[PDB]
Amino acid sequence: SPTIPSRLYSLLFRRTSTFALTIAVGALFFERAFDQGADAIYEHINEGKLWKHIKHKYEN
Amino acid sequence: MTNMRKTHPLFKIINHSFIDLPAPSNISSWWNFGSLLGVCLMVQIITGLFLAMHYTSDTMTAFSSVTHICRDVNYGWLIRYMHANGASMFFICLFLHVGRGLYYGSYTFMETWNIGVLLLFAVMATAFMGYVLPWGQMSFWGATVITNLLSAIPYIGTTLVEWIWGGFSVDKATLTRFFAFHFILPFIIAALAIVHLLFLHETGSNNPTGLNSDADKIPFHPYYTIKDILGILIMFLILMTLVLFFPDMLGDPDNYMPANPLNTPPHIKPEWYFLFAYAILRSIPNKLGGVLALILSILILALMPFLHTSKQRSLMFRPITQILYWILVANLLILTWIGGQPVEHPFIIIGQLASISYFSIILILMPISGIIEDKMLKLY
Amino acid sequence: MTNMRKTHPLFKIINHSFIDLPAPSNISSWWNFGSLLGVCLMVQIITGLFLAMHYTSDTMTAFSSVTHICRDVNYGWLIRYMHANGASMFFICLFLHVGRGLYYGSYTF
Amino acid sequence: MLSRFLGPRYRELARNWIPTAGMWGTVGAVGLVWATDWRLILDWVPYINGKFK
Amino acid sequence: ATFAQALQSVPETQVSILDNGLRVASEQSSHATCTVGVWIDAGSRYETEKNNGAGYFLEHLAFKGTKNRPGNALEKEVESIGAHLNAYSTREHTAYLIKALSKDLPKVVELLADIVQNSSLEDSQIEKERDVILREMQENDASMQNVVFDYLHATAFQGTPLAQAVEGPSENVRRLSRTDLTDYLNRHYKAPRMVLAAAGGVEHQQLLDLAQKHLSSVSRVYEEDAVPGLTPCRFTGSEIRHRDDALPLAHVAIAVEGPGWANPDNVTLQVANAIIGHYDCTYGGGVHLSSPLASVAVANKLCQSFQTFNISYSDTGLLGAHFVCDAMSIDDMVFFLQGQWMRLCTSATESEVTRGKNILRNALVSHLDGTTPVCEDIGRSLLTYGRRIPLAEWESRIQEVDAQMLRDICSKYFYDQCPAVAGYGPIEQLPDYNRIRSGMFWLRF
Amino acid sequence: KAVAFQNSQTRIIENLHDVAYKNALANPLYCPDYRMGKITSEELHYFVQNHFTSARMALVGLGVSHSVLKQVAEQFLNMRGGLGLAGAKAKYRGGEIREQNGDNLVHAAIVAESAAIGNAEANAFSVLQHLLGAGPHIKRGNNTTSLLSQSVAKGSHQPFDVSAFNASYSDSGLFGIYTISQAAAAGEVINAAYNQVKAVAQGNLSSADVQAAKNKLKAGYLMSVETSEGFLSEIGSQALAAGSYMPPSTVLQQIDSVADADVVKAAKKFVSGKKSMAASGNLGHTPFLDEL
Amino acid sequence: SHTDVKVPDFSDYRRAEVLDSTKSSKESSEARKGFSYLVTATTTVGVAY
Ligand code: HEM
Ligand code: HEM
Ligand code: HEM
């Protein structure tokens, strides 16, 4: 069985256009995943202090 | 010893571009005009800088600051009307420069021509935002009309227009960002003009005969130095007789009223050098059609080097295409006259025929005429 | 023939200044700093241009326009504080660039 | 457009370079919908549906 | 009288095997002369860096006296019949070949049986040939393409026996003894690695009878049963540069790893080389040459010469280009050369492939002309492939190549590969390895 | 011309022909330096119109039938005139050119007039060439049967190379000795080779050496006609020189018809003939023609 | 002599999968290129974000 970077080079990293397509698709999924992770980390650090954690007591 | 002019790395470029540059000996006064444009650019920048030390880009105070410049700053009226009539002189010299390039076949220098049409677009945008800047009645309504017709682009046009406005209409943010952009674009124009000079200096200048002038070239200094100085003096004579004697013959009186969003003027115009394009913009009863008509009416100069079908570069020995060229200048003047007229009979049909004739002469009639002229000389 | 990077008159200037320019192999990180200065200059210009899109040079409204940038313009506080701290970063890079020139004998140019 | 580039060799060159051109067009389309955050495209990709874009 | 049945009309190479295992192969023609050679599967790849000059020094010593023909007698009855005696050593093969008349065919064979079997290695002759080899390496130092190809092997096959030269270093030449030469002979001159090849006016049954009478009962047994093996050689993407600005011209070789002898892709790669071709300053074609590299080298006055090579060893090789040019053109030449490679990886059309196929067909048929290159091809064919590949098989393998598999093979062996670079002379404008490695792929593809 | 003159023996052969002939064989194969930049198109047209005529051409084909070759011959090669210009018979002068250029090796060639193509004596001269050494037969050999190498090698401890030079043209001949030696020992090498040829000219030779020289000549001819290029060059040369195709068996028969007394006569003709010398290198110790 | 030169040992710098000179390349070149280009691609993704 080949190594995972060997498969990535054989499929995606060989041609420059496929390299750019992989970069763009990874940019979308990386943006979404990092936005989720960073928002979760910041909200976990600031539990009970943000407006979105206390707005249910005033929505009536 | 060492010749300092040809060895010092700052003086070497100045030498190669202005002193020991081999220029054609037979270029007429029309070749002065581009240098005049550079001088006009510097003049505009200098006058613009001395307008910027007292102008305020606030909608409450812009008209008040302009009147304060005209009435309380020492010789501030002089600098303001020099700036306005120097913009008009810039467009006069620009139109004659483009006409020289069209007549003498100078568009075969393709990179120089394309950097030129980029410079022309930048100068038109700079003059438009500068005319918006005094915040008169005419400035506000001209900006409103131009952006409202720019909103004709499908699916992005309203978003793009509200992004340019920074709001629902032409407001304080529009005036402040127009001040910033009008300040910053002439330096980009100066850099693009440096690129323009470099792309010309790879190959030398054209001559009115259109032939290879390598056998007869002279140094730029002192011949074209003193010729450009004389042209600068004549252009300054026309500029100062425009400023000191008829300071409002080219402007609009309604720009001396403050900007009223509630009051609309009975007839809305841009300043005169836009007017022909405005006529083309209203020669089609479709908003997208008029917008693309304006864009291709400016970009047809960029399309021009691919339409040259003659074996002779210049029009000095080509009388039929000379006749077609002067008919083109004629209906360009006609479109300039129509653009300042209101939209009734017979201005609508005259402007439609003038736009059709303009596009048909540039697109169709000149290459066919060049083919016929090649057939007459037993070349085709 | 097709070596456009060294035949195109615009592209040969960028080539001769940034691609085929012979540079010493052993220059340390101090030689980075001047390039940083140019980039920092660009940053200042860009931030200043956006700061010029909402600032009024009137004594009754200059402070008000600065507060309006910092409060009401979307990420206007970011642009203003990048401009101020980029001025500070520009002077840091100037001091280190001048110190490199003093230390390594570069003033003989 | 011109008679210089008409023939079998130029057709073979176009057939050689057409999947690369299509892949670059796909790269440009994905980059455009990524930079502009085009909702009509991005509200069909399953993972980024929670971004409301 | 078509090309296919003309290649069918070529006589078949007839191969037999003796009792000790040495191959005997012959091809018959109507020529009155003949070429009879002995090919031994031995070279500098089989040496272990203590006897690195051994095969070279033995081929120097082979014609200077044997046990039954001492001293200069072997010269006297090789040239009393007008025969010509030649020998050469590559990194993998050794050849001793005689050009003679057909009627002198028996004696020539036993002369070969006197050379590879009963050589007498006299010590004063060892000293004389040691001095001769030292000054002959001094002569070879001033030929820049030999230096560049040795540098290319040394930087492409680092840490392996394929890096070292056939001649070896000068210190080994100074300290090789007679015992090491006898050990080299008794290790590598074995019967199952020997082919007696003959071409021209040779009767195969007569040649087989003479090989049975003269070449039998030799070797076939390792005395300590220490059977050697041929380990694979690692290719290393690297660069060597020997800068010396006093030389008038600069020689640069750039290569990638080849596939080896047994891979059929060599044929396709040969067609690729035929698309790029060669050029020298005395070529009469000028600007109208079909090769784009040669045409742009004429038009821009870039190179003194260039050539393309596909050197193959046992499952390895060097596939690349060598050019000599002045300093101020070097980088520009590299640029155009790399462009041609990427064109063959991306935009190979059928017209240039057909031209390369015709060039390769003409090249191999023109090379197989005369008794000496036919016998040379027979010896290499039985040493490498184990058989003599007929010329119709070569034509079929050429004609099965089209533009699609040429693009595939060129992309597999060329695109995004780390090359080996060797440079000698005014090579200051020779670009960096990073720039060359970036030029080995295209961002537009 | 620069690539051809990169090696010294080309210039030696050019200078030797210029020494040996007054005209019509002393014209150089390569263009002179002053004539570069001056050869015009009408000179080429004049040369082609006066020398590329039908009676001086032979069309030779290997791998084609006679019908195709003769029909392209009647469709192309019928528009030319005749025998063209005659020539100038290539009269002999002799002399010496010494080109001092400070090389590490001295190249010298001493030649005399010999028989032309078609004379039987020229065949004897060929045998005499293989009596004296016309090239090595072993890669890195000692040239044991070469008489010149045996005569020079006993008195030389430094590298040398001596051979016999033979050049037969349609009206003339040039047989001589080529020597390459060190600068300090050129005189003894040249004198030893000349004394070897003088000893051959006095009837001091073995019949076994004549038989070995004949075998060398026959093997050289049969190896020269071995390839298709050499075969077609031989056919074209025979068709131009004699107008007929001579079989190789007949060539070997007239080689075997040569007597050893003819070899003695050829060596005596070289010895008694007027000499022509072309030398190059550091010629401080290279002897002159009267000093031999 | 030009045959006297030898490339020195680079085994302190070489990767583990190219450290042995008796084994071939091209069954590990794609892995090394994939690792380096994965580093480059992840850098490009971060810069693009
Ligand atoms: C960087 C240099 C420039 C600066 C700083 C500048 C600045 C200004 C300022 C402050 C005004 C408002 C004052 C007024 O009402 O006249 C103005 C007006 C104007 N500017 Fe500029 N300007 C510059 C260059 C130019 C150029 C190159 C043009 C020509 C394309 C131009 C065309 C105009 C026009 C048409 C007006 C309107 C004048 C009027 O009120 O009638 N400016 N400029
Ligand atoms: C921003 C305003 C412009 C400036 C400052 C400018 C500057 C110059 C200068 C200094 C020259 C050399 C002197 C001369 O031949 O007149 C020149 C020539 C030229 N310019 Fe411009 N230019 C401008 C606009 C344009 C435009 C809009 C075009 C395109 C239509 C253009 C096309 C050319 C051409 C083709 C020449 C060559 C003249 C010839 O050899 O015939 N320029 N320009
Ligand atoms: C042409 C480009 C530039 C423009 C248009 C520009 C414009 C402005 C504007 C409008 C302000 C006021 C807004 C504010 O207070 O933050 C400002 C502040 C400032 N600028 Fe610039 N600027 C430019 C370049 C620079 C440069 C190159 C520097 C020096 C590194 C610089 C240093 C500063 C400083 C120190 C402040 C004060 C920051 C503060 O206290 O808030 N600017 N600039």
Alpha helices (H) in chain F, listed in sequence order: 8-20, 41-51, 66-76, 120-132, 147-153, 186-201, 207-224, 228-241, 248-256, 260-272
Q: What are the φ/ψ torsions at residue F93 (nearest 5 degrees)?
A: -120, -45
B114 vs B299: CA distance, rounded Å: 10
CA-based nearest residue to E321, from E251, E233, E247, E230: E251
B91 vs B242: CA distance, rounded Å: 14
Asked whether F266 and F85 are in contact (CB, 8 A), the reply is no
Q: Where are the domains of chain B?
A: 1-380
Asked whether B264 and B270 are in contact (CB, 8 A), the reply is no
A41 contacts: CB under 8 Å, gap ≥ 6 = none
CA-based nearest residue to E354, from E273, E267, E271, E289: E271
Tokens at residue F272, please?
A: 């008694």
DSSP E266-306: HHHHHHHHHHH--EETT-S-GGG-SSHHHHHHHHHT-EEEE
Can you name the residues that pair with F276 across neighbouring β-strands? F95, F111
Peptide bond into A2 cis (omega under 30): no
Measured between CA atoms, the residue of chain C closest to residue E332 is: C3
Task: Out of E27, E47, E59, E92, pick the active-site residue.
Answer: E59
Q: Which residue has the tokens 């190669």?
A: B16
F95-100 β-sheet, strand order:
F95-100, F276-281, F105-113, F172-182, F161-169
B97 vs B91: CA distance, rounded Å: 10
Asked whether B141 and B169 are in contact (CB, 8 A), the reply is no
B186 CB near ligand 2 (under 6 Å): no
Chain C residue numbers with beta carbons less than 8 Å from the beta carbon of B56 are 56-58
CA-based nearest residue to B313, from B196, B197, B204, B208: B208
E269 vs E351: CA distance, rounded Å: 16
Question: HSE on the CB side for E184, CA within 13 Å?
Answer: 30
CA distances from E65 to B377, E119, E185, F146 (A): 89, 7, 16, 18
Q: What angle do CA A41, A47, A50 make, to 5 degrees?
A: 100
Residue E59 a catalytic site member: yes
Tell me if C57 and B57 make a contact (CB, 8 A cut-off).
Answer: yes
For residue E340, which amino acid is it?
A: Q
Pairing of strands E239-243, E420-425: parallel
E strand segments, chain C: none
Asked whether G35 and A5 are in contact (CB, 8 A), the reply is yes
B214 vs B322: CA distance, rounded Å: 26
Tell me if D47 and A29 make a contact (CB, 8 A cut-off).
Answer: yes
Q: Where in chain E is the domain with CATH 3.30.830.10?
A: 3-215, 238-439
E353 vs E351: CA distance, rounded Å: 5
Where b means 16+ CB within 10 Å and e means fewer, E254-287 reads bbbbbbbbebebbbbbbbbbbbbbbbeeeeeeee
Q: Which residue has the tokens 């005696």?
A: E85
Asked whether B185 and B122 are in contact (CB, 8 A), the reply is yes
B83 CB near ligand 1 (under 6 Å): yes
E178 vs E180: CA distance, rounded Å: 6
Pairing of strands F95-100, F276-281: parallel
Asked whether E439 and E335 are in contact (CB, 8 A), the reply is yes
Asked whether E200 and E102 are in contact (CB, 8 A), the reply is yes
B27 CB near ligand 2 (under 6 Å): no
CA distances from E304 to D50, E150, E423 (A): 65, 21, 15
E89 vs B49: CA distance, rounded Å: 83
Q: Left (φ > 0), alpha (ψ -120 to 50) or beta: where does E438 sit?
A: alpha
E200 vs E34: CA distance, rounded Å: 5
Chain G nearest-CA distance from E219, in A, is 28
Number of separate domains in chain D: 1
DSSP E76-115: HHHHTTT-EEEEEE-SS-EEEEEEEESTTHHHHHHHHHHH
Tokens at residue B256, please?
A: 């001396």
CATH number of E3-215: 3.30.830.10
**Does chain E reach chain D with at least 3 CB pairs under 8 Å?**
yes
Tell me if C56 and B176 make a contact (CB, 8 A cut-off).
Answer: yes
Q: Which residue has the tokens 């590879």?
A: E116
Measured between CA atoms, the residue of chain C closest to residue E333 is: C3
Nearest to A17 among D20, D45, D50 (CB): D20
DSSP assigned state of E307: E
B193 CB near ligand 2 (under 6 Å): yes
Measured between CA atoms, the residue of chain A closest to residue E417 is: A14
Q: Which of residues 3-42 of C touch E (CB under 8 A)?
A: 3, 6
DSSP B119-176: HHHHHHHHHHHHHHTT-BHHHHHHHHHHHHHHTTSTTTHHHHHHHHHTSSSS-HHHHH
Asked whether B192 and B115 are in contact (CB, 8 A), the reply is yes
Which protein residue has the closest C-alpha to ligand 3 atom 16? C80
Most distant CA pair in chain D: distance in Å?
53
Residue B54 a catalytic site member: no
CA C62 to chain centre: 26
CATH architecture group of domain E238-439: 2-Layer Sandwich (3.30)
CA-based nearest residue to C90, from C41, C50, C31: C41
B214 vs B199: CA distance, rounded Å: 18
With 0-12 / 13-18 / 19 or more C-beta atoms within 10 angstroms meaning exposed / middle / buried, residue E161 is buried
Cα(B106) to centroid of ligand 2, in Å?
Answer: 9
Where b means 16+ CB within 10 Å and e means fewer, F210-238 reads bebbbbbbbbbbbbebbbeeeeeebbeeb
Q: What angle do CA E417, E420, E424 make, to 5 degrees?
A: 145
Tokens at residue D15, please?
A: 């057939």
Tokens at residue G1, please?
A: 């002599």
**DSSP H or E run through F279:** strand F276-281
Q: What residues in chain E have their Cβ under 8 A from chain G's Cβ atoms?
A: 137-138, 140-141, 146-147, 150-151, 154-155, 158-160, 163-165, 167-171, 231-236, 238, 240, 242, 257, 315-316, 416-418
Q: What angle do CA G13, G19, G20 make, to 5 degrees?
A: 155
Ligand 3 atom nearest to C90, measured from its CA: 30
Chain C residue numbers with beta carbons less than 8 Å from the beta carbon of E332 are 3, 6
Cα(B244) to centroid of ligand 2, in Å?
Answer: 29
Tokens at residue F124, please?
A: 């004897």
User: Binding site: what residues of B are annotated?
Assistant: 83, 97, 182, 196, 201
CA-based nearest residue to E184, from E64, E260, E98, E89: E89
> SS3 of B59, please?
coil
Chain D residue numbers with beta carbons less than 8 Å from the beta carbon of E407 are 16
Tokens at residue E437, please?
A: 């490695």
CA distances from B174 to B129, B153, B180, E217 (A): 10, 20, 10, 104
Q: Left (φ > 0), alpha (ψ -120 to 50) or beta: where does B217 sit?
A: beta
Asked whether A32 and D52 are in contact (CB, 8 A), the reply is no
Task: Out of B6, B8, B201, B375, pick the active-site residue.
Answer: B201
Measured between CA atoms, the residue of chain G closest to residue A35 is: G49
Tokens at residue C36, please?
A: 């940083």
Chain D residue numbers with beta carbons less than 8 Å from the beta carbon of A12 are none
CA distances from E16 to E19, E215, E368, F17, F277 (A): 10, 13, 22, 54, 57
Chain B residue numbers with beta carbons less than 8 Å from the beta carbon of C58 are 56, 58, 61
Ligand 1 atom nearest to B41, measured from its CA: 27
Cα(B116) to centroid of ligand 2, in Å?
Answer: 6
C62 vs C69: CA distance, rounded Å: 11
Q: How many CB atoms lie within 10 A of CB E198?
A: 33
Q: Which residue has the tokens 């002019």?
A: B5
Chain G residue numbers with beta carbons less than 8 Å from the beta carbon of E146 are 2
Q: Name which of E342, E347, E408 to mutate to probe chain D: the one with the most chain D Cβ atoms within 10 A of its Cβ.
A: E347
Asked whether F126 and F184 are in contact (CB, 8 A), the reply is no
Which protein residue has the closest C-alpha to ligand 1 atom 5? B48
B84 CB near ligand 1 (under 6 Å): yes
Identify the chains in contact with D, defined as 3+ C-beta pairs within 8 A: A, E
With 0-12 / 13-18 / 19 or more C-beta atoms within 10 angstroms meaning exposed / middle / buried, residue F165 is buried
End-to-end Cα, chain G, rounded Å: 56
Peptide bond into B222 cis (omega under 30): yes
E303-313 β-sheet, strand order:
E239-243, E420-425, E250-257, E316-325, E303-313, E279-280
Q: Which residue has the tokens 């102008």?
A: B55
CA distances from E93 to A42, E43, E84, E170 (A): 71, 5, 20, 22
For residue E196, which amino acid is it?
A: L
Question: HSE on the CB side for F255, CA within 13 Å?
Answer: 25
For residue B57, which amino acid is it?
A: S
Please indicate the experimental technique that yielded this structure: cryo-EM
Q: Resolution of the deposited coordinates, in angstroms?
A: 2.6
B175 vs B164: CA distance, rounded Å: 11
B353 CB near ligand 1 (under 6 Å): no
